[PDB]
Amino acid sequence: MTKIKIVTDSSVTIEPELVKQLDITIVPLSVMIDNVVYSDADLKEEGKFLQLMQESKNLPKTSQPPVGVFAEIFEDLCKDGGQILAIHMSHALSGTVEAARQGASLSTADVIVVDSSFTDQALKFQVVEAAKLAQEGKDMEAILSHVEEVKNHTELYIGVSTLENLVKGGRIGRVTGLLSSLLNIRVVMQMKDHELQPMVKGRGTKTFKKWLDELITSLSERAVAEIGISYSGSDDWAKEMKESLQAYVEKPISVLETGSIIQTHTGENAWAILIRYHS
Ligand SMILES: CCCCCC/C=C\CCCCCCCCCC(=O)O
């Protein structure tokens, strides 16, 4: 029989070489910059979108992939007779996973669609694990259950230096219980069960450092499988966090610029820590 094929979306943050090595298909979102629509696939060069967003007259606007695009990719991918497992960013952030469900129903292909409950490198954990097992010839039930195990041992922490992109883009509606009379302020949230939960907020330049010290304390008694760090803007703070965190995980930490889809909604000088604990 034909190996299962893994699909995800371009909100995933992943080393490009791993996409090829694992035969992962990435369905691109799009972003409109000063009324010109770019495919996210053309916005992967380091720092390119950051510069565009710094200079554009308008805040960019992100768009999910069309239903019909998923239908056509699913139809092409199944020509080998194999099943498809599509793992996507949370429905709370984007309609992408729902467009995939609809594309699956329109296709003649045998398509399973899974909401990762995250995005960025936390979505990467599930997609990579799925594709590794797919490559080994595992069946759909075995892959789904291992992906779920990964999801359920994953945590996502995100810091932003302004609220304005979250407000304008709308995903502030997913932040539970945040009260700020200021947009320009530092906030650290945990994405848990499709909600952004504020852990702390503050104007000061030490708001992230003190939170980091608390995270590190909490890691003393945890077995950690993988940590990834993502950022928008410069990588200075991300590299600093890596220096403190690398001691807590054997696997080398991936420090990656987040994609245009995320940058549009977080703003510059944002960061994420994506942790996967041992199952
Ligand atoms: C700096 C890296 C941040 C990684 C974690 C990001 C998680 C939550 C923050 C909110 C992100 C919202 C993304 C919205 C994408 C919407 C795409 C669409 O138009 O459907």
Side-chain angles (χ1 to χ4, degrees), residues 1-148 150-279:
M1 300 183 177
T2 295
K3 295 185 176 308
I4 291 166
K5 300 188 175 182
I6 305 305
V7 166
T8 191
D9 64 68
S10 68
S11 80
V12 77
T13 299
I14 186 172
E15 300 84 347
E17 55 248 46
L18 206 47
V19 182
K20 305 184 190 173
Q21 298 299 314
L22 295 170
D23 288 327
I24 294 155
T25 302
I26 299 192
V27 185
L29 284 73
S30 73
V31 191
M32 190 171 60
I33 317 173
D34 292 347
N35 298 328
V36 174
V37 177
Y38 297 71
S39 171
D40 193 31
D42 301 327
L43 287 177
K44 291 308 179 183
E45 180 182 317
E46 175 179 15
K48 182 180 179 182
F49 178 74
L50 169 67
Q51 175 184 77
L52 298 176
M53 181 162 60
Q54 286 174 334
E55 307 295 352
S56 61
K57 298 172 195 170
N58 307 323
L59 220 50
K61 156 73 167 62
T62 64
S63 298
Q64 68 180 252
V67 179
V69 166
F70 277 105
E72 295 182 352
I73 288 166
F74 292 159
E75 204 65 37
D76 179 69
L77 280 179
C78 82
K79 294 294 139 280
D80 294 335
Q83 312 170 280
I84 289 147
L85 169 55
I87 302 159
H88 292 297
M89 109 170 90
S90 174
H91 75 277
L93 305 180
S94 185
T96 294
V97 62
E98 180 54 26
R101 288 189 188 108
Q102 292 179 19
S105 309
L106 292 172
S107 174
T108 66
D110 192 356
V111 185
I112 305 303
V113 182
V114 162
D115 187 328
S116 75
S117 79
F118 303 111
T119 185
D120 190 83
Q121 287 198 65
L123 170 60
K124 181 197 72 180
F125 298 160
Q126 292 175 45
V127 171
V128 167
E129 170 82 355
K132 169 194 179 286
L133 300 170
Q135 211 165 239
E136 303 169 353
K138 297 293 196 303
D139 51 60
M140 186 62 80
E141 192 283 331
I143 299 176
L144 284 166
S145 298
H146 286 81
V147 171
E148 278 162 49
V150 171
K151 172 182 65 147
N152 291 332
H153 288 82
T154 290
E155 296 176 341
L156 184 160
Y157 300 103
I158 169 173
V160 301
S161 296
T162 182
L163 294 180
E164 180 148 75
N165 302 61
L166 270 176
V167 169
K168 299 298 307 183
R171 274 61 179 172
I172 194 80
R174 304 304 187 181
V175 177
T176 66
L178 183 60
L179 272 55
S180 186
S181 55
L182 299 175
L183 294 193
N184 289 333
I185 190 174
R186 297 173 167 96
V187 181
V188 180
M189 292 161 284
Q190 181 177 7
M191 187 168 193
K192 183 188 299 178
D193 205 18
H194 306 275
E195 298 177 3
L196 297 162
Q197 299 180 358
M199 311 193 82
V200 64
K201 66 176 182 309
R203 297 184 65 254
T205 57
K206 288 153 62 63
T207 298
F208 295 149
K209 183 50 177 190
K210 295 197 311 170
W211 182 90
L212 182 66
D213 294 338
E214 293 173 5
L215 169 68
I216 281 168
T217 295
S218 74
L219 290 183
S220 313
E221 297 304 339
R222 294 308 297 278
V224 182
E226 176 164 9
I227 299 183
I229 296 173
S230 298
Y231 63 94
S232 62
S234 52
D235 66 0
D236 295 319
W237 170 237
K239 283 166 37 195
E240 189 175 332
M241 287 195 297
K242 176 186 183 192
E243 288 304 319
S244 302
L245 290 164
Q246 188 64 84
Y248 294 91
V249 58
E250 181 161 359
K251 173 180 191 65
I253 289 179
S254 300
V255 173
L256 300 176
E257 189 184 36
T258 196
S260 82
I261 295 309
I262 301 309
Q263 292 183 52
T264 291
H265 293 274
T266 61
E268 179 177 2
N269 300 326
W271 58 264
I273 294 167
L274 308 312
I275 303 176
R276 176 197 160 212
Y277 303 94
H278 277 290
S279 307

